[PDB]
């Protein structure tokens, strides 16, 4: 089987990107944060305290004839930009894009932060990290990949982000029409749970490539791109004006300048993203100061490769007995 379904950003900065997903039966059609970097699919639900929902759709597991509680099954997962939720567990039929997985873990939350909350765009997310980060007590459940792979024409999941566009999640297959030149491979650690890799090094704009190992995450949950002090600093000393400012919480820039493209190694391929790309507007509204998309990963502790770097390329999850990642131009 396969299944392909679009993904379209939430705002107009691309925050995040919202894909339709099918839940019980009827089917009940929530949109979701497709997350590489974690590994729970939880809803917003009938459940949820009133005063927690604002215009999110909800998951009504009794209007669902597929829908079955998991006794004395709970869940509380915690991101790391500091939201959270927590509530109880069903299985329930889950469909993406016509790929359909039967007694899936629809975590129903009970209780979301605030930043869940103000977001009226997404109804939930839907973890794709290992089954292993996975947060259901007593008995850890899997994720919708991990249920649907043996199923699937291949063990895989693709990722094509769009820059202020749709873009796609496909399930089972690889889309050869979708990318440029070659797909380079690279090798996955899952010792943390997450699609770990190390990239091989860095440019910023039409500047020399330096060859350094940067160990991170392939995090379509997260915004921006996360790199050590060294490379962010060389990064935004190429801008003018630019400067880390505490206050705001990163690197800003003046909203007039022209922001250089960065490239980033996968083996001895390179992606490029456009400066465009890590312009992220004004701090606040109406501001001529600027928050940019590529930020200290220092005191987060892993190095992230969110959708700023995500969307620049096509990129292969494949979870096939040993783990790749595979990237390519498009």
């Keep these: 089987s396969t299944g392909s379904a679009t993904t379209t950003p939430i705002d107009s900065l691309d925050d995040a990107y ?25 809803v917003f639900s009938s459940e949820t305290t009133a005063s927690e929902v604002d215009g999110q759709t909800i998951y ?21 930009d500091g939201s959270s939720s927590s509530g109880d567990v069903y299985t329930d039929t889950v469909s993406v894009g016509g790929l359909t997985v039967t007694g899936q873990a629809v975590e129903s939350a009970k209780k979301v932060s605030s930043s ?11 973890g794709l990290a290992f089954s292993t980060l996975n947060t259901v007590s007593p008995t850890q459940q899997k994720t919708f990949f991990d249920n649907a792979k043996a199923s699937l024409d291949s063990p ?46 860095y440019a910023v704009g039409s500047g020399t490539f330096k060859s350094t190992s940067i160990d991170g995450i392939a995090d379509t949950g997260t915004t921006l791109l996360y790199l050590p002090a060294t490379v962010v600093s060389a990064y935004w000393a190429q801008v003018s004006g630019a400067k880390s400012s505490s206050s705001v919480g990163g690197y800003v820039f003046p909203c007039s300048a022209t922001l250089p493209s960065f490239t980033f190694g996968v083996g001895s391929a390179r992606i490029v993203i456009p400066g465009d790309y890590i312009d992220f507007g004004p701090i606040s509204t109406g501001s001529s100061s600027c928050f940019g998309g590529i930020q200290s990963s220092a005191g987060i502790g892993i190095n992230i490769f969110g959708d700023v770097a995500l969307k620049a390329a096509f990129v292969v999850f494949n979870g096939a007995t040993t783990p790749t990642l595979g990237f390519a131009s498009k």
Aim: charged letters at 10%; a negative charge.
């Design 156 to 201: 895989v999941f693709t990722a094509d982000l769009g820059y202020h566009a749709p873009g796609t999640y496909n399930f089972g297959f690889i889309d050869t029409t979708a990318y440029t030149g070659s797909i380079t491979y690279t090798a996955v650690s899952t010792k943390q749970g997450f699609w770990e890799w190390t990239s091989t090094g």
């Design 18 to 42: 919202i894909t339709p997903v099918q839940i019980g039966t009827p089917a009940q059609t929530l949109n979701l944060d497709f997350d590489t970097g974690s590994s729970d699919l939880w």
């Design 116 to 126: 869940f909350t103000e977001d009226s765009t997404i109804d939930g997310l839907l």
């Design 60 to 80: 009504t597991p009794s209007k669902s004839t597929t829908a079955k509680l998991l006794s004395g099954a709970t869940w509380s997962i915690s991101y790391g």
